[PDB]
Design a protein around this ligand. Sequence first.
Ligand SMILES: C[C@@H](Oc1cccc(-c2ccn[nH]2)c1)c1cncc(-c2nc(Cl)c[nH]2)c1
Ligand SMILES: C[C@@H](Oc1cccc(-c2ccn[nH]2)c1)c1cncc(-c2nc(Cl)c[nH]2)c1
Ligand SMILES: C[C@@H](Oc1cccc(-c2ccn[nH]2)c1)c1cncc(-c2nc(Cl)c[nH]2)c1
Ligand SMILES: C[C@@H](Oc1cccc(-c2ccn[nH]2)c1)c1cncc(-c2nc(Cl)c[nH]2)c1
Ligand SMILES: O=c1[nH]cnc2c1ncn2[C@@H]1O[C@H](COP(=O)(O)O)[C@@H](O)[C@H]1O
Ligand SMILES: O=c1[nH]cnc2c1ncn2[C@@H]1O[C@H](COP(=O)(O)O)[C@@H](O)[C@H]1O
Ligand SMILES: O=c1[nH]cnc2c1ncn2[C@@H]1O[C@H](COP(=O)(O)O)[C@@H](O)[C@H]1O
Ligand SMILES: O=c1[nH]cnc2c1ncn2[C@@H]1O[C@H](COP(=O)(O)O)[C@@H](O)[C@H]1O
Lengths: 351, 351, 351, 351
Amino acid sequence: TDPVPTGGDDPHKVAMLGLTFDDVLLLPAASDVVPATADTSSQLTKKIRLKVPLVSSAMDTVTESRMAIAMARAGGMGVLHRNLPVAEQAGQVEMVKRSGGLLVGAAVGVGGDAWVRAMMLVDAGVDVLVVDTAHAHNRLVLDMVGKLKSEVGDRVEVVGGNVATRSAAAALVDAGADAVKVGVGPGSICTTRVVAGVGAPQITAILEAVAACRPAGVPVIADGGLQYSGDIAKALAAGASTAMLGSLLAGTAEAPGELIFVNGKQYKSYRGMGSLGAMRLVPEGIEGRVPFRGPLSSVIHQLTGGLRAAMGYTGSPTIEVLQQAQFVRITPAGLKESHPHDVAMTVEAPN
Amino acid sequence: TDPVPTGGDDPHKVAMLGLTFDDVLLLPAASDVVPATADTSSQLTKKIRLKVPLVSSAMDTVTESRMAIAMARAGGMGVLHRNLPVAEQAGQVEMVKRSGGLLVGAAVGVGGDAWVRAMMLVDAGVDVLVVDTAHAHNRLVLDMVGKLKSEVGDRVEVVGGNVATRSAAAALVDAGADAVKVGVGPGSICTTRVVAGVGAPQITAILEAVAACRPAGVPVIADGGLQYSGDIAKALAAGASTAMLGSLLAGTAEAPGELIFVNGKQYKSYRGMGSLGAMRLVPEGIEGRVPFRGPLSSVIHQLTGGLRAAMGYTGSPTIEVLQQAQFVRITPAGLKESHPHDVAMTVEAPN
Amino acid sequence: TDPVPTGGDDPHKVAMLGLTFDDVLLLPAASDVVPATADTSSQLTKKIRLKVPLVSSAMDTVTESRMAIAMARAGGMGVLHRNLPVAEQAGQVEMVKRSGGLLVGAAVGVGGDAWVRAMMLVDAGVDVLVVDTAHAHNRLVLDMVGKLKSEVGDRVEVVGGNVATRSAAAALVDAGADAVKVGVGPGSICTTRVVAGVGAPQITAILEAVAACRPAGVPVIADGGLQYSGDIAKALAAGASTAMLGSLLAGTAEAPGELIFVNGKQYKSYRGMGSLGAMRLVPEGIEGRVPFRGPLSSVIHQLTGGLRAAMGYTGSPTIEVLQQAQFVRITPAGLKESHPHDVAMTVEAPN
Amino acid sequence: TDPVPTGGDDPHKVAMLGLTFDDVLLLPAASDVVPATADTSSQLTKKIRLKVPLVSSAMDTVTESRMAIAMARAGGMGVLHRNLPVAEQAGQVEMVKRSGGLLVGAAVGVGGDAWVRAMMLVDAGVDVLVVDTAHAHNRLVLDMVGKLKSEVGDRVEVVGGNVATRSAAAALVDAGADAVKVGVGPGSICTTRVVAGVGAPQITAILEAVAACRPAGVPVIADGGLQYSGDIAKALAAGASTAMLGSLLAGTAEAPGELIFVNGKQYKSYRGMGSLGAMRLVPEGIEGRVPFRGPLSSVIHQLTGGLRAAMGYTGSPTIEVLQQAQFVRITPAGLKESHPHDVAMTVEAPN
Ligand SMILES: C[C@@H](Oc1cccc(-c2ccn[nH]2)c1)c1cncc(-c2nc(Cl)c[nH]2)c1
Ligand SMILES: C[C@@H](Oc1cccc(-c2ccn[nH]2)c1)c1cncc(-c2nc(Cl)c[nH]2)c1
Ligand SMILES: C[C@@H](Oc1cccc(-c2ccn[nH]2)c1)c1cncc(-c2nc(Cl)c[nH]2)c1
Ligand SMILES: C[C@@H](Oc1cccc(-c2ccn[nH]2)c1)c1cncc(-c2nc(Cl)c[nH]2)c1
Ligand SMILES: O=c1[nH]cnc2c1ncn2[C@@H]1O[C@H](COP(=O)(O)O)[C@@H](O)[C@H]1O
Ligand SMILES: O=c1[nH]cnc2c1ncn2[C@@H]1O[C@H](COP(=O)(O)O)[C@@H](O)[C@H]1O
Ligand SMILES: O=c1[nH]cnc2c1ncn2[C@@H]1O[C@H](COP(=O)(O)O)[C@@H](O)[C@H]1O
Ligand SMILES: O=c1[nH]cnc2c1ncn2[C@@H]1O[C@H](COP(=O)(O)O)[C@@H](O)[C@H]1O
């Protein structure tokens, strides 16, 4: 019997071919939709629907109270980070609720201290708890999701993550999750791929997680690796219902941290939660900076405008129709020309 | 049942593998043709044949009256842009007609104002109307094509675009189009691919559109992404009958705009019609610059000379025979060496 | 009959598709393992098990007595290089044995002088002899392995290498090798690939060698091309039992050579054993430098920490379970984003 | 019926997948050969065998009398260029013959003037005539080969080229060629690929030409694209019997032209024979420069040493055995590491 062409005698050792966002484009289709008439609303969880299908990352350089307020007013939601005392995180929930009863979420870990944290957040009025781990395919994480749903599941929605396979998503569904968050490897500040050699390209990870979650009616949150507004449209067409953004929002006025004026240009700090600085395990994230981008309201406007353009080209009046769109796969030669190919740019572009 | 190797259980979710110009080369074949004896004439529309199979883009940094006159004298044609008052566009048609009854086209949009524009252009003597949209697979665009053909189709030829699929090209054929223009995603100044995440690699887009148009006798115009004279030969071998050029002609003396002397080198402005500056929707084009290239007559001479070389290598005495030539697909390692690989260039090359 | 699609009529002329480390990632799986509870021990040879599955390269810029002592104290082993007189190499074995009866290996060549060298190393107390060649698929190399095993095989373990195919690994197994070392082409300082045009991508080379060695109970040493801690996890998941490191350890305090302060940064010399300088045959290696990395103990700590993270993500309590993990294949677009993609790094990262 | 996955309904429109040198490596195999014992002799034509399987390009910056003398003394051969008067080219043949009756070849074109040139070269004692064209798959070129063989074929050997397909090679075999030269697209100074969009990756072109020539006993000359000594071994393993070199020899003392000292480094001119300067048709080559490399004897020594290393790794005692060796295909990730990957080079390497 002949060998597998890439080596050895086991045809399942190399189990899949993984696609990322840069590997695909959306095909145009017959359409009566124009960008202005598209409806961008979508489910965050079984019970919660958002007007704009975007949430901010649970990171100490992205989401505290000011970002959560601005995201909710823009039609999305923020998830407050958990790298601070319980009493301070619960107080940031109250500040958001004092600005109009806006929707808000908050991250928790696994174990006894994370349980005390979760109960204080519920008492403060939080709408969504996010069980927030590097590897959710573990019985202790599944137990945490199920115990929260049993005790406070009537009052608050419970998200679990992160996963990158069909089998991991199915395990969270069986544990009672109200949404499943997908992403191991893809984030802009992630070094899991080179430190551990572990990960999954994000278009294939979404397609596999959706194969388990869609038949059960559980929404999927696509978390990490989104670099352009067009990546949001690709993630939702692969079957996700919302997208979570770190890098794209870390440059805004509302993100925690001060402005950095260096060489006449401006920046703000952005770091992984598994970086040396955030943990103060070998680190699985870096500490860096991103360009300053101005007010959050204007960033969200440009991102939703690109999504609306994609809905016009694909004939999708709603996000549920966009989830049925088709891809064309591209080669390396086709990606290099996608970033403005060979015409000296001179003027600023908003998107 | 096993999953699709790239994810999920649907084998049509990733529907195609899209090739661009850099993915293919033309194979040499048995030939009695030398570059000097090749015949470069080809159909622009059902009724109009050109001596040179090239047209200039309908852009406000590429084609007004001076470019249209020079293109027609060179054996091709210009399409006048529509980012100006109706009375001015109609007057540029008259200026072209006063220089010898040369062929000329002009762009129009969709709706009531575009209808008034179209009727004034016909009264001024235009030969070709181009229904000029970002997404032609839409009933309002198909209605515009059909209504023009019904009212003035005896006097003027009617083009519709742009499309990137077999089904979209078939819909324009059924509506009465005299030619179909192909290109969503590929242009040098296009950002649709990253803003909306939408597009189609241009060799596959041409092959699919031709599968619908050739059996009906409708010519295909390949519009966008052409960077070298060899790309013209590849587009026509994939089945197109003419090519439309923006970047390659924006540097010429006849293009609208003034010369830009900067750092001892010279440039001219070139911008997408969906850029912020041209529209004064989120933008789907950039504003930039290209190197100055001299007179149009000399640029067209070099481009047609490269086409003639391809016809010699493939044994094609006419464009209709070139449309039957074969490709070899190349890998990433083969493209890097195609751009002069590893020999410090010292002297200027015209092409 | 149709041609093979890549040329000619022989479907075995291009025999395989070879994958390297950058072509694959490890898939997360169901896990009760956390990085702290993983067991990193593994067989170096049939009779010798190490606490940490790493050995240092047999190179005159990587391993003399100080590196061998530090590697053994860290739980791994060093292999002393053979580019020095027999009496000096045997004396370095004694120095290692005087620091606590630590484990140590030493390289030898093929022929009569290499036999005298081998006997002196055994008299000095060496634990492992490494028959150390550029191409081990040769009857003289197989004879050397078998004769050593016959004469001193009761006292010392005998390794042979290097190979890159299933048939070559099988020949070393039949000759009596206690471990098989894999790697032709992949090393950071190797130029065999461009000087001779010969080599084998290392993930496929490991998969093929393991197909011969695992059924016989012979461990495989993955030698060359490892650039990050995650590459160690990939090599062991492909079926290797230990990894050998040159570049990653050449920057440490214990490596032979002096520090190089240049432009405020620090370096140390690193060169192939087939470079012009080491041989003083056309050269098949280069002479260069690598950044200074500090003490060996700290480098090994970071490398084993990344391995432990991979064991947590894959649910592997032991190295024998990690050898059963699965890969996802990635495209060129997915690799570019793996190296910290698009976030200006500002702070130092240990790994 | 479903479409072809890359577009259209014709499965032969994209006829082949073309491999270049960077797409493959030679696999090591069982061997009793060491580099010193390999036999590098090989057929140039049916009747002429060389000691070293290399010839110099017929270019006015590579081969006049001094290069032809040095190549023959090194065991190879030179082909004198034809961009000069007939009387001068014939006189350079005599100069070579006055230095010891060394072997020499000379290029000619097609037509009446090329016939007069050919007869004068034969009278001057030339050993090989090379019918030297950009596209040999043409009845006028085949007639020239056949008429030369009929008139002077008893005294001189007749080569024809260049081709890049099985059918073109078969036509030259039927016309009586004593060897077939392969290469359309691959040369370092070639711009046919971007000017005409025409070419064929060189490993696939050799495999296809050999499928026609080997069964007839006609040797194949691999011409263009060779960048390293390892590329020579790959070309011969694909089935060629000799290789022709331009760039690799244009830097030597014996090449025509003067040394260029610029910025403390040294260069020499190198230009295509279809460049603007050589023709004084649109140009299909560039004019440039290459680094100075010293005496030819030393360059040939390093190139043959790399070939000898490949013969050791593959177990090939002769070139006829190397022509039976096997390849592994590599991905883009595997090529980037082949050029010395990540170790600051400090010292000069001869090869
Ligand atoms: C922003 C602008 O981008 C482009 C892109 C390509 C061509 C042109 C253009 C303008 C004039 N001639 N060609 C404009 C634009 C203008 N209107 C409609 C669209 C649009 N519809 C759907 Cl559905 C999706 N997106 C986009
Ligand atoms: C411009 C010039 O380009 C080359 C390319 C490769 C080799 C040479 C060359 C010249 C002399 N020796 N080799 C010239 C050229 C000269 N003539 C004919 C052609 C030609 N025919 C067909 Cl059909 C297509 N294109 C091209
Ligand atoms: C170093 C640190 O890396 C990350 C990576 C991604 C997300 C986060 C994070 C922290 C807080 N929220 N999200 C941390 C970390 C923290 N703990 C556990 C792990 C881990 N477990 C297994 Cl199994 C393997 N590796 C990794
Ligand atoms: C020039 C030199 O290149 C290397 C490459 C890899 C490892 C080493 C090495 C030296 C000492 N330990 N390891 C040397 C060399 C030394 N001898 C033999 C060969 C050789 N044989 C065959 Cl067959 C083909 N080429 C190559
Ligand atoms: O240190 C880390 N390592 C790996 N992933 C991380 C780390 N910190 C945060 N993440 C993930 O990265 C996402 C942000 O990705 P981005 O939007 O591409 O910048 C977050 O929402 C987390 O899922
Ligand atoms: O703003 C824009 N976005 C996208 N495509 C555009 C825009 N403006 C013009 N185009 C297209 O780009 C083509 C020019 O492409 P180029 O020849 O590659 O520069 C035009 O003929 C249009 O089809
Ligand atoms: O000159 C040489 N050419 C090729 N391979 C070499 C040479 N010297 C050492 N090696 C190999 O390269 C390995 C080190 O690879 P690295 O860890 O990628 O730097 C060694 O353990 C040897 O197997
Ligand atoms: O102008 C030209 N265009 C294309 N190919 C050329 C030209 N001049 C020479 N060649 C070819 O290029 C070969 C040299 O290729 P190199 O060794 O890669 O530099 C010659 O032997 C010719 O076959």
